Design a protein around this ligand. Structure first.
Ligand SMILES: C=CC1=C(C)[C@@H](Cc2[nH]c(/C=C3N=C(/C=C4\NC(=O)[C@H](C)[C@H]4CC)C(C)=C\3CCC(=O)O)c(CCC(=O)O)c2C)NC1=O
Ligand SMILES: C=CC1=C(C)[C@@H](Cc2[nH]c(/C=C3N=C(/C=C4\NC(=O)[C@H](C)[C@H]4CC)C(C)=C\3CCC(=O)O)c(CCC(=O)O)c2C)NC1=O
Ligand SMILES: C=CC1=C(C)[C@@H](Cc2[nH]c(/C=C3N=C(/C=C4\NC(=O)[C@H](C)[C@H]4CC)C(C)=C\3CCC(=O)O)c(CCC(=O)O)c2C)NC1=O
Ligand SMILES: C=CC1=C(C)[C@@H](Cc2[nH]c(/C=C3N=C(/C=C4\NC(=O)[C@H](C)[C@H]4CC)C(C)=C\3CCC(=O)O)c(CCC(=O)O)c2C)NC1=O
Ligand SMILES: C=CC1=C(C)[C@@H](Cc2[nH]c(/C=C3N=C(/C=C4\NC(=O)[C@H](C)[C@H]4CC)C(C)=C\3CCC(=O)O)c(CCC(=O)O)c2C)NC1=O
Ligand SMILES: C=CC1=C(C)[C@@H](Cc2[nH]c(/C=C3N=C(/C=C4\NC(=O)[C@H](C)[C@H]4CC)C(C)=C\3CCC(=O)O)c(CCC(=O)O)c2C)NC1=O
Ligand SMILES: C=CC1=C(C)[C@@H](Cc2[nH]c(/C=C3N=C(/C=C4\NC(=O)[C@H](C)[C@H]4CC)C(C)=C\3CCC(=O)O)c(CCC(=O)O)c2C)NC1=O
Ligand SMILES: C=CC1=C(C)[C@@H](Cc2[nH]c(/C=C3N=C(/C=C4\NC(=O)[C@H](C)[C@H]4CC)C(C)=C\3CCC(=O)O)c(CCC(=O)O)c2C)NC1=O
Ligand SMILES: C=CC1=C(C)[C@@H](Cc2[nH]c(/C=C3N=C(/C=C4\NC(=O)[C@H](C)[C@H]4CC)C(C)=C\3CCC(=O)O)c(CCC(=O)O)c2C)NC1=O
Ligand SMILES: C=CC1=C(C)[C@@H](Cc2[nH]c(/C=C3N=C(/C=C4\NC(=O)[C@H](C)[C@H]4CC)C(C)=C\3CCC(=O)O)c(CCC(=O)O)c2C)NC1=O
Ligand SMILES: C=CC1=C(C)[C@@H](Cc2[nH]c(/C=C3N=C(/C=C4\NC(=O)[C@H](C)[C@H]4CC)C(C)=C\3CCC(=O)O)c(CCC(=O)O)c2C)NC1=O
Ligand SMILES: C=CC1=C(C)[C@@H](Cc2[nH]c(/C=C3N=C(/C=C4\NC(=O)[C@H](C)[C@H]4CC)C(C)=C\3CCC(=O)O)c(CCC(=O)O)c2C)NC1=O
Ligand SMILES: CCC1=C(C)/C(=C/C2=NC(=C\c3[nH]c(/C=C4\NC(=O)[C@H](C)[C@H]4CC)c(C)c3CCC(=O)O)/C(CCC(=O)O)=C2C)NC1=O
Lengths: 160, 161, 177, 249, 103, 177, 177, 177
């Protein structure tokens, strides 16, 4: 709820459309200290990268009211309000949302919306982590680069 | 729906008191500022359309929430705004005359933030519009009258938040 | 195990109905894109041995505590077993992309794999990374946007088959989490 | 000796060393003939007599153009504050001139003469006497508020760039139309109020009377850059007291 | 309280940091060596608040509405002369719920 | 993890770019050393898969009665749970190193932990040894004085960040003693 | 200061090597395109008074708070010292375009410029979007694609000189960032 | 020595004092058992950060109520201030071990400390508990009887200096009692 309030995504899931939120408990957020997952998600801790934070939180909102009872051995996909598809897979009473492994079944909400508690944070499929802030580097000199470009007489094999 | 005078009767009735002489404190200004509030409500009635045209051009219309996809794109949706901003500038005028913001939450604030979340209206841009509308209202009515009319604008912005 | 044909059988068995004309359009469209699916499995099987070495070593260069002593990729039996279960998982996903339903993925591959990896002491955080690098390769091979090997395919679209194999690897990553 | 070469650029020429090359020349003029050879290097110069002549006492020069830019910061570090003496101060300029230690921006504010009007007048005298630990907490809070105010000013610049691309198919499509008005340009036609503009309607600025999607997000930029510049001038005098929290310590 | 004049403004200067750099001399320094600080106080020295501001909402008065019936959170003066007290109590209420004195 | 700093919102329809009324002043001032802090948490969590296996096996080789039959780490359910509690403690230390305060450590992890271990029969005198190995492990990474793994960094100092993370590890160990 | 030929000497002085035969192949193609370089700085210096008035008055079109009271371009002493500063930046960029190397821009102009502008109260974000209007003006004057003034050149291609003077202008905005 | 040690120690301002070769042998002739004594303070200050982070934490390891909410090693500014005060007494013992007198430790570091710790509400029994740990370490480091480390010294006896460093630590506890 705090990330929603800061990131401005919370206005979106205020709306009356029937949503199926997969809100991760903070043990899931506390479980973001993977050596692996910290690579692709730590860069969002920077205060300018609210841009991807909406795009990663908006992957947890599903248009429609998918209760766990509605997932009796059914595998149906859908895209989020982020814009990319997510596969909800309920088999053997183990309902999955990407890499969710849902903990608590459903929570009935106001506008016919449902809330499922997940064990991890779903990263969108074609999400690349933002690079760290770097140094704008400038070519040191100009004769090391004319010497870096192949002349036309080189391209025809006239020269070495 | 109580004014400054109602409020004192109304508070002072419920403990059946008569007025406890201090009680009139507020009342005794209130009548002192009675001349200021009418002239403040006078010019605001005259420049109602001009104030709302100044606020939206200074705040809100300078970021999407005018372009396609933004919350204010279609002409029905744009026309709902100036209809919607008219109530804030109008009901704030009522609070400025009555000297008590009871009319705002009675007729504006209750079910308001719960309604914008239903429609998906951005509360952030709404308050900015009222803040800009508060800024132009201090232009017309002056400093202290703007302090009075401005005192009910942020009351709307606070509860609407 | 089931497939894309027998999934709508046992769904139509639950309503005790016959497989009528409103459900054959889910299947006749599936067979009409049957040549696209067979061209989609063949991008995986033709790079199946180099994808598992691409992915387990990418788990090592992000999480270097596995090759430290006391880790879980330390010895040669432990490294070769981690090259085994990168491709055994890839063996069942390539069955489940071929069959069109994830029943083989959820009764043979994931048949208590979370109970295995706890009892083996395998770190489950690193095996999410080894599965998901194979997810990021398979959506580049099916869409033919791998940066260093292009295969010659007839033009069209495979965003459905790329998003189907992206839901099979997340299925694996949901259950061993 | 390092402090003696520092003041000769200040006391006689009225500036700083321009770079380390000019300062290392004057250690060779001292190596040749000593004190009176090094002292006569300034008064027998063409830069002396073109500025001060034979009649003016030397002074600290605030010209405009500064052929190294880093010599402006160094002359405000050297001649800083009206009540400040040069007695028992340490040596200040070797590490700025070799790009080792950057000059802090509060040490340039002590060197500059005081203007009447600032946008943000300084709380140099209005910081309360609190401890060293509460000055460190109030500095790191104000540095953090300035970092978040920067990255919502950058989001305002991306909205100005998106507002111009929204209207650029029509901004250039109306640039080769024939838009002829009815009045306002030639004086033979009755224009009324619009001979110029009429009676108070020019505004406080002139750009506030112009309507448009890109003018309206520009006024959002000017109110967002005011709050960043207010809190960037608040970390200067929080730091400067830090210099006197430590220099006197 | 600052009774610390016995610890003057040469306070945490930490003289005995000693670095031998081999078999040679001891090279005693004077480094202050600050902590993992943070100096936790509220309401610091300046505002640090550009625009962005409309956070104030009044307190919840229960089920009535905020700030409407404060006639029980009320205020004093005479209660009149012929008021005579009550037999049953039915102890004190959350402000007679919605309608005010002037309904 | 993502609550440990403050991200600024700039777009419309947010509610927090306009009406939010606060920049977080205590968290806008923690990115003022934040590049030094994010490298320090990157030292731990890129070695945390090696840190938990070294520390748990450190107290086995210093006290061999825990893998004795009748000891508290003999069964495979108990050996997996002892490896799980070391990683979960190491993550919540890495929360509190990242967030800069030990409030999140003493709320989710340390609250009701001494009452857990004396109800389960977990030995507390051996469990504080396993934390204090990880106290000695984490100061070697942050000062980059570890023996068999170095990491590239920018040039500077990282004392009072190793000294900050030593202040969380005894805070764990005294809450369970 | 250095130029393009002093830059290749101090690289060769670092290895104590002679400027041989293979690295004279690139120096002879610098001097062969030296007539386009003089034909390019002549299209900037000829337009240089209107370049800093299209830029400073285009900075005001995106920020009306500069010409509000208290503003940075408010009074006549302050607008004159900003039109002075905008053509100092255009002077040292044209020196580095002429010299072939940006060493005269980095130490005589851009060194210490950021904390100069903090101390006077200059908004550094308005300078970055002022020198980026001059960046787009210069690359329209090199490539002869300005809409209101065309100059007469010989036929060919000066795109490498356009992105060399573009990199001298985003070297300014990296220093006042 | 003392002259230039005191000169930048209590005798004046913040210098350092670099000691050279020909000044060293005059100091070793002046200081009795100087080749043992310059190994004695080298066995302390080369292990300075290891000795503090025991001794602050070992106070919490025996008194766990200090990091309770309401204790004084709660609220991380106070926990870091206890670690700086533990580092100061460890340093100022070693200058008294270097100079051979407790005079400079008393006036600069120790006078008024008893009134200071009762003005801040510092629990003064635990500070004696903290310096008894540092009393126990410094007799072990000087005699090379340390547990996990041993130092390569010239062979001999240093029990007379180990009793001399015992006579500095209890003067702290006699003052703050
Ligand atoms: C998204 C993830 C993310 C990170 C991992 C860090 C990575 C990171 N660290 C530093 C920059 C730095 N990092 C360190 C830290 C260290 N150096 C040492 O020698 C110590 C061993 C170690 C501390 C544990 C130091 C000392 C600096 C220099 C800047 C400073 O001191 O503030 C910089 C700035 C580079 C520069 O401008 O020079 C970056 C991007 N920041 C991030 O945003
Ligand atoms: C039904 C589906 C199916 C699988 C998925 C695999 C997975 C699998 N791997 C191992 C066995 C192992 N598996 C691993 C694997 C790993 N450890 C790591 O650090 C990495 C995260 C990961 C590799 C990517 C290792 C290191 C062992 C060795 C354990 C041992 O030798 O006892 C075992 C126990 C077998 C045995 O040792 O007898 C199984 C069942 N095999 C299967 O039959
Ligand atoms: C630090 C260690 C490190 C590595 C070893 C590589 C490993 C690696 N490669 C890819 C990403 C990929 N990896 C492969 C794998 C291969 N390419 C082929 O053609 C063969 C089949 C196979 C090598 C034999 C493919 C096809 C992609 C997709 C992009 C592409 O190569 O076109 C990814 C996922 C994207 C990412 O997170 O970067 C990773 C981790 N990257 C690293 O960061
Ligand atoms: C025995 C083994 C066996 C196979 C390997 C496949 C071989 C195969 N692939 C396609 C045919 C195709 N394959 C693709 C697929 C793709 N094209 C792209 O540009 C994408 C990169 C990729 C998506 C995954 C498309 C788009 C067609 C043509 C349209 C279609 O068949 O539906 C066809 C039909 C056209 C033809 O005659 O070639 C056949 C036989 N079928 C088999 O029976
Ligand atoms: C330049 C800086 C400088 C130092 C750091 C010390 C170090 C030092 N000490 C001794 C020499 C010695 N050092 C010790 C000290 C000890 N031996 C023990 O058994 C104890 C554990 C420990 C006491 C703490 C003794 C006992 C001698 C020999 C007697 C003496 O020379 O005083 C020697 C001479 C060894 C040799 O001849 O090779 C040196 C270099 N002296 C210095 O001049
Ligand atoms: C959020 C914080 C958090 C924690 C700190 C742990 C704390 C914790 N540990 C255990 C449970 C356990 N914890 C241990 C661990 C140990 N016993 C030993 O002898 C060693 C000293 C030590 C490993 C280093 C063991 C062996 C069990 C199982 C006890 C049993 O089943 O008999 C349990 C009971 C439920 C379970 O089985 O997991 C809990 C809540 N879990 C949490 O959720
Ligand atoms: C009898 C059984 C026995 C063990 C199993 C080991 C385990 C072990 N290692 C360390 C001590 C340490 N352990 C590590 C950990 C590591 N070093 C690395 O290079 C890897 C990345 C990582 C292991 C995977 C580090 C960095 C130290 C600090 C000392 C050092 O720099 O090596 C300690 C604490 C010792 C101390 O504090 O003095 C212990 C018990 N030691 C033992 O005595
Ligand atoms: C009213 C508000 C107002 C504005 C918004 C700006 C308009 C403006 N003009 C230019 C851009 C320019 N300005 C010039 C300058 C000139 N053209 C010529 O032919 C003359 C020789 C010379 C004036 C003396 C040139 C050459 C360009 C580049 C565009 C082009 O013509 O190709 C840019 C740069 C785009 C960027 O940010 O990258 C902007 C914003 N000027 C304003 O006044
Ligand atoms: C070596 C290279 C070199 C430079 C780059 C300039 C840098 C520079 N600019 C100014 C001085 C100034 N610079 C500005 C500039 C601006 N305010 C704005 O609205 C814009 C964002 C911006 C440029 C258009 C103003 C307004 C002053 C005067 C301050 C004032 O009196 O209000 C000064 C102080 C000059 C003095 O007063 O003596 C210096 C050193 N000078 C140099 O010697
Ligand atoms: C004293 C002042 C002085 C000058 C202004 C230049 C004048 C100048 N420009 C060119 C000649 C040229 N100038 C250009 C440059 C351009 N043509 C274009 O189409 C682009 C718009 C623009 C890129 C910047 C080209 C392409 C040639 C001809 C080829 C060449 O000289 O390499 C030449 C002929 C050289 C030759 O052909 O051998 C001369 C003398 N030289 C001077 O001595
Ligand atoms: C050079 C000589 C020298 C010293 C001897 C110390 C003495 C000292 N300690 C503290 C200050 C302090 N000292 C402690 C220390 C402790 N509290 C405990 O619970 C533990 C028992 C013990 C640490 C082990 C704490 C907690 C504070 C801060 C008090 C507070 O901020 O609430 C202060 C600051 C007081 C102030 O600012 O007014 C001083 C001067 N510092 C010095 O510069
Ligand atoms: C820099 C490396 C370095 C160390 C780590 C320590 C290691 C160390 N600790 C102690 C000695 C001690 N060390 C500790 C510290 C602790 N004990 C506990 O109860 C906890 C496990 C831990 C706090 C987390 C304590 C409490 C003592 C005993 C002090 C006493 O006598 O009461 C001794 C003295 C033994 C002797 O002199 O023979 C030594 C060498 N010393 C060093 O030079
Ligand atoms: C899809 C339906 C739709 C419409 C039509 C629409 C109109 C619209 N017209 C606007 C402005 C404007 N529109 C005009 C238009 C005109 N001036 C003239 O002389 C002409 C008579 C006329 C055009 C033919 C002008 C001058 C402004 C700017 C007014 C100002 O800056 O104050 C604005 C505010 C700026 C903006 O966000 O673009 C909106 C939202 N929005 C919509 O969603």
């Amino acid at each position: 709820v705090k990330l929603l309030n800061e990131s401005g995504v919370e206005k979106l899931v205020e709306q009356a459309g029937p949503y199926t939120v997969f809100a991760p408990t903070d043990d899931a957020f506390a479980a973001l200290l993977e050596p692996h997952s910290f690579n692709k998600l730590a860069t969002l801790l920077r205060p300018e990268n609210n841009d991807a934070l909406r795009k990663v939180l908006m992957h947890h909102v599903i248009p429609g009211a998918f209760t766990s009872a509605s997932l009796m051995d059914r595998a149906v996909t859908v895209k989020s309000l982020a814009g990319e598809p997510i596969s909800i897979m309920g088999l053997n009473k183990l309902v999955t949302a990407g890499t969710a492994k849902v903990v608590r079944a459903d929570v009935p909400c106001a506008n016919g919306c449902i809330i499922h508690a997940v064990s991890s944070v779903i990263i969108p499929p074609n999400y690349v982590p933002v690079p760290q802030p770097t140094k704008p580097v400038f070519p040191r000199s100009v004769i090391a680069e004319i010497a870096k470009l192949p002349t036309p007489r080189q391209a025809l094999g006239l020269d070495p | 729906m109580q004014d400054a005078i109602t409020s004192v009767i109304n508070a002072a009735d419920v403990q059946g008191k008569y007025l406890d002489a201090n009680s009139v404190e507020k009342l005794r200004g209130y009548f002192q500022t009675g001349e200021l509030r009418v002239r403040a409500a006078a010019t605001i009635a005259a420049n109602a359309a001009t104030i709302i045209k100044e606020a939206v051009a200074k705040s809100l219309l300078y970021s999407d929430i005018t372009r396609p996809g933004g919350n204010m794109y279609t002409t029905r949706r744009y026309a709902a705004c100036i209809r919607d901003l008219d109530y804030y500038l109008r009901y704030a005028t009522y609070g400025m005359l009555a000297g008590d913001p009871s009319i705002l939450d009675e007729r504006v604030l209750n079910g308001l933030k719960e309604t914008y979340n239903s429609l998906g209206v951005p509360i952030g841009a709404t308050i900015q519009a009222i803040q800009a509308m508060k800024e132009v209202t201090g232009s017309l009515v002056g400093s202290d009258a703007g302090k009075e009319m401005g005192l009910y604008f942020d009351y709307i912005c606070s509860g609407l938040s | 195990m089931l497939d894309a044909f027998s999934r709508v059988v046992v769904n139509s068995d639950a309503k005790a109905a016959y497989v009528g004309g409103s459900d054959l359009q889910a299947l006749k469209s599936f067979i009409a894109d049957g040549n696209k699916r067979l061209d989609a499995v063949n991008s995986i099987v033709s790079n199946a041995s180099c994808m598992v070495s691409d992915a387990v070593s990418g788990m090592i260069c992000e999480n270097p505590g596995l090759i430290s002593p006391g880790g879980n990729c330390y010895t040669n039996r432990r490294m070769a077993a981690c090259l085994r279960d990168g491709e055994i998982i890839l063996r069942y996903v390539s069955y489940a992309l071929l069959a069109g339903d994830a029943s083989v993925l959820e009764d043979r591959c994931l048949n208590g794999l979370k109970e295995t990896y706890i009892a083996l002491g395998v770190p489950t955080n690193s095996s999410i990374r080894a599965v998901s690098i194979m997810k990021a390769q398979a959506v580049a091979f099916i869409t033919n946007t791998a940066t260093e090997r292009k295969m010659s395919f007839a033009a069209g679209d495979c965003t459905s088959l790329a998003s189907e194999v992206a839901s099979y690897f997340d299925r694996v990553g949901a259950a061993i989490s | 000796q390092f402090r003696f070469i520092e003041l000769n650029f200040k006391h006689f020429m009225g500036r700083a060393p321009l770079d380390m090359a000019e300062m290392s020349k004057h250690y060779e003029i001292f190596a040749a003939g000593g004190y009176d050879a090094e002292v006569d290097s300034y008064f027998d110069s063409e830069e002396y007599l073109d500025v001060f002549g034979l009649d003016t006492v030397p002074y600290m020069r605030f010209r405009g153009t500064y052929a190294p830019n880093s010599t402006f910061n160094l002359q405000c570090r050297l001649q800083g504050g009206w009540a400040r003496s040069d007695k028992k101060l340490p040596m200040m300029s070797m590490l700025p001139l070799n790009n080792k230690a950057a000059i802090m921006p509060h040490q340039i504010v002590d060197g500059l003469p005081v203007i009447p009007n600032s946008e943000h007048p300084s709380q140099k005298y209005n910081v309360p006497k609190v401890s060293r630990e509460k000055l460190q907490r109030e500095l790191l809070i104000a540095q953090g508020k300035a970092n978040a105010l920067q990255i919502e000013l950058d989001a305002a610049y991306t909205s100005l760039a998106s507002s111009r691309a929204f209207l650029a198919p029509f901004a250039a499509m109306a640039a080769d139309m024939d838009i002829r008005p009815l009045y306002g340009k030639n004086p033979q036609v009755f224009a009324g109020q619009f001979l110029g503009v009429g009676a108070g309607q020019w505004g406080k600025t002139g750009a506030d009377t112009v309507r448009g999607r890109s003018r309206r997000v520009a006024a959002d930029i000017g109110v967002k850059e005011f709050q960043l510049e207010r809190v960037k001038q608040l970390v200067v005098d929080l730091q400067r007291a830090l210099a006197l929290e430590d220099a006197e310590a | 309280d600052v009774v610390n004049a016995a610890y003057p403004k040469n306070i945490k200067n930490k003289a005995p940091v000693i670095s031998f750099d081999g078999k040679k001399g001891v090279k005693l320094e004077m480094v202050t060596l600050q902590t993992f600080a943070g100096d936790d106080s509220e309401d610091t020295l300046f505002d640090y608040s550009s625009g962005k501001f409309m956070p104030q909402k009044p307190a919840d008065m229960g089920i009535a509405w905020p700030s409407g019936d404060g006639r029980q959170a009320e205020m004093k003066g005479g209660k009149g002369s012929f008021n005579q007290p009550d037999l049953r109590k039915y102890g004190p209420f959350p402000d007679f719920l919605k309608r005010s004195m002037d309904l």
